[PDB]
């Protein structure tokens, strides 16, 4: 069993000081600095995690392809497909009701 | 390092002017044509000697070609 | 002698409120024209737990009536409100639970909470969990109404003070018996440093006026005048009665 050491000058097991021990040539084990776990986007109404958008750090979406950070739909990337269907029905049905309620009832 | 998959991608790669150095490695089974470009080190694994020779014909004459074998340079 | 712990509390060094994870200030929106001559519609986005208080807080979202954008408020939840509900505030609001109305448009016998003692001051009375105030009478002569405070006291207010219809949520909070000293320790997570209270008689003569001698006792009456100086004001102040009631 090969025992390793911290490479950087951090000495405490904080969230940002996560390490992974991998093997290298000759039976030597080195230290890799592993990333933190992020959260994905959430629907602004129901707070459910959206599909089609990866769970990566906020600055990493700048490196993402322009089509890999949003879904091709009205309110894509901010609202679930169910969050949007009810939006359309609300917009249409209420406007229809306001046409028979007022405007020569 | 990137790996090209078929011949026509590396024929096109050589006839462009962006090549910087070519290293040929001969192994127990295959031959790798690691063309060094400005950004990446593209390589092609060929399994036929005749196809390997054709690649050496297409290599330009102003570019340096390094042959590597069971002994490191 | 020394300074008693009651004196040290007024300095506010380790007795400051532990208000770091608190949500904000729970109050009505500022009074304007649309709250005085019309109604505004608010949407209850969420109901949340505010540390250090027993009642939940509602994140209500009104549209900005004068500019383009939103206006995010933080109300005290009336018992019954749910997410996605619509609430209306203004002089013309309906008498439904959760709606904010001037105290003069509410009928006699109605129940309101988060009442304003002075118009536009965004809520003073009846804010704790389960508490409420009842409207007693109106006086159109000078536009004043009477309400009964949760302590049984009767108070007269201007008829245009706002109030939320209903009962503050979280009722019955104090009916569950605390059982462990640890549970009482956790009660003051978002409050002041006051919990483990040493009896004065167990102290020494320097520290407290009760600090006794060879037997733990007070030695002098524990009912004091209101005009006692700080430091010796310990026990019962201006007490008109004592003992057990029958």
């Amino acid at each position: 069993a090969v025992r390793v050491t911290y490479v950087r000058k951090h000495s405490y097991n904080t969230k940002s000081n996560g390490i992974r021990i991998v093997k290298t040539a000759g039976g030597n084990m080195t230290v890799q600095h592993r990333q933190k776990i992020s959260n994905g986007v959430r629907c602004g109404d129901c707070g459910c995690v959206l599909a089609g958008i990866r769970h990566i750090r906020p600055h990493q979406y700048g490196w993402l392809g322009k089509s890999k950070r949003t879904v091709t739909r009205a309110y894509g990337g901010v609202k679930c497909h169910k969050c949007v269907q009810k939006k359309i029905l609300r917009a249409f049905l209420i406007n229809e009701h306001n046409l028979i309620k007022l405007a020569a009832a | 390092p990137k790996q090209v998959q078929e011949f026509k991608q590396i024929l096109k790669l050589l006839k462009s002017g962006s090549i910087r150095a070519v290293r040929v490695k001969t192994n127990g089974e295959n031959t790798k044509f690691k063309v060094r470009c400005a950004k990446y080190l593209y390589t092609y694994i060929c399994a036929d000697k005749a196809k390997a020779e054709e690649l050496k014909k297409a290599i330009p004459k102003d570019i340096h070609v390094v042959e590597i074998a069971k002994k490191a340079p | 002698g020394r300074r008693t712990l009651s004196q040290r509390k007024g300095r506010g060094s380790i007795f400051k409120s532990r208000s770091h994870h608190k949500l904000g200030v729970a109050q009505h929106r500022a009074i304007d024209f649309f709250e005085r001559h019309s109604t505004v519609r608010g949407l209850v986005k969420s109901i949340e737990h505010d540390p250090g208080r027993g009642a939940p807080l509602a994140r209500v979202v009104f549209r900005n009536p004068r500019q383009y954008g939103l206006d995010k408020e933080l109300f005290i939840c009336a018992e019954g409100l749910y997410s996605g509900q619509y609430i209306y505030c203004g002089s013309k609001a309906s008498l439904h639970i959760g709606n904010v109305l001037p105290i003069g448009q509410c009928p006699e016998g109605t129940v309101v909470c988060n009442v304003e003692s002075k118009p536009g001051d965004r809520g003073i009375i009846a804010r704790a969990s389960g508490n409420y105030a009842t409207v007693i009478s109106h006086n159109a002569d000078n536009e004043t109404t009477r309400i009964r405070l949760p302590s049984g006291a009767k108070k007269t207010l201007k008829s245009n003070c706002r109030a939320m219809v209903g009962i503050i949520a979280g009722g019955g909070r104090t009916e569950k018996p605390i059982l462990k000293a640890g549970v009482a320790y956790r009660m003051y997570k978002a409050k002041r440093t006051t919990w483990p209270r040493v009896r004065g008689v167990a102290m020494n003569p320097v520290d407290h006026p009760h600090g006794g001698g060879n037997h733990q006792h007070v030695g002098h009456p524990t009912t004091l005048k209101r005009s006692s100086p700080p430091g010796q004001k310990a026990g019962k102040v201006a007490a008109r009665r004592t003992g057990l009631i029958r």
Partner: protein, 90 residues
């Protein structure tokens, strides 16, 4: 499993019989499920003191500290309803 100490058997024998009997009523009602006033499913569980969430129905309701609706908060909803009707008509 137990004769007459239902849920407060976790407290063992160290808080007084009466204090364990009193807390038993609250602790049963605090963890119990309630009928959701919108979707009518017994799927409402307490999140915090005074906050109740309908699990398979996507709603949050403000209620009592340990019960979804208190007695005091139940007669108020009817009392306001009666006054609202009287105010509208005459």
């Amino acid at each position: 499993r137990t004769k007459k100490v239902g849920i407060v058997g976790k407290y063992g024998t160290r808080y007084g019989a009466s204090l364990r009997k009193v807390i038993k009523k609250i602790e049963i009602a605090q963890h119990s499920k309630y009928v959701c006033p919108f979707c009518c499913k017994e799927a409402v569980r307490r999140t915090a003191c005074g906050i109740w969430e309908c699990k398979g129905c996507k709603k949050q309701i403000a209620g009592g500290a340990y019960t979804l609706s208190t007695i005091s908060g139940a007669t108020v909803r009817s009392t306001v309803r009666r006054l609202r009707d009287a105010k509208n008509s005459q």
